[PDB]
Symmetry: C2
Subunit: 141 residues, 2 copies
């Protein structure tokens, strides 16, 4: 749709920051589309990833970090609030101890900080979605 | 780039048909981009897939068919002629007994027919690539 995918935005995060993403899968769930959201330590795509959030629509979600080039301990969830063929609203909130992921207003995943969120310099949203809204909030000290 | 992705084209295939695809991955191999090519029995995206060809760039290729809604026997290859960061040329030729997949001119995969190629009505090319060329040949009887 309107925002380019892959979508890259320079970003800073700290406690109280919220990343809001509105989009739609590009395929029916039977065809197994994916969504990926990566919080990077540099603007370069090969940089470390403080928070990796990857949705296999209709199947599972995997979360991880990539530290000094290497993937760490994978967290796998079978929670699937995303609905086949529907637009979704994703909210990722930076809490003192973890990221909290809301899907269509419902708390759906959390991921404890492995690297301080202040290390983030960039957010990338990609794979099989169209994007109509992307926002990072900057209201807190 | 120039062709829209996901890319869908109505198509017919028989012995001697060649499907030629030129494109580039949208991410470095470290970020594990994908490429998928599906030969469908109808224009509808949920239709059966006579040949499913899915490249996890830098990792593996999986091939399968989806018959009456259900995936059949997966074939997994670790052959990886695709080069990190490079444009690729993919050629899929319909032989009497199998599809033959050429990558940058080199024979790289084959897949025996499970459903007659005459059942194909549509080709879809999608996942994390840009596309500059797509052609189906129609020169043979």
């Amino acid at each position: 749709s309107l925002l380019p995918v892959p979508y890259t935005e320079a970003a800073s995060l700290s406690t109280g920051s919220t990343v809001t993403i509105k989009g739609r899968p590009l395929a029916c769930f039977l065809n197994e589309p994916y969504l990926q959201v990566d919080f990077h330590t540099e603007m370069k795509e090969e940089s470390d990833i403080v928070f990796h959030f990857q949705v296999a629509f209709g199947r599972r979600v995997v979360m991880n970090s990539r530290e000094y080039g290497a993937w760490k301990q994978q967290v796998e969830s079978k929670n699937m609030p995303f609905q086949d063929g529907q637009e979704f609203e994703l909210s990722i909130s930076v809490l003192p101890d973890k990221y909290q992921v809301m899907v269509n207003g419902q708390s759906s995943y959390t991921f404890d900080h492995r690297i301080k969120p202040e290390a983030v310099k960039m957010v990338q949203v990609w794979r099989d979605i169209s994007l109509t809204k992307f926002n990072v909030s900057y209201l807190k000290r």
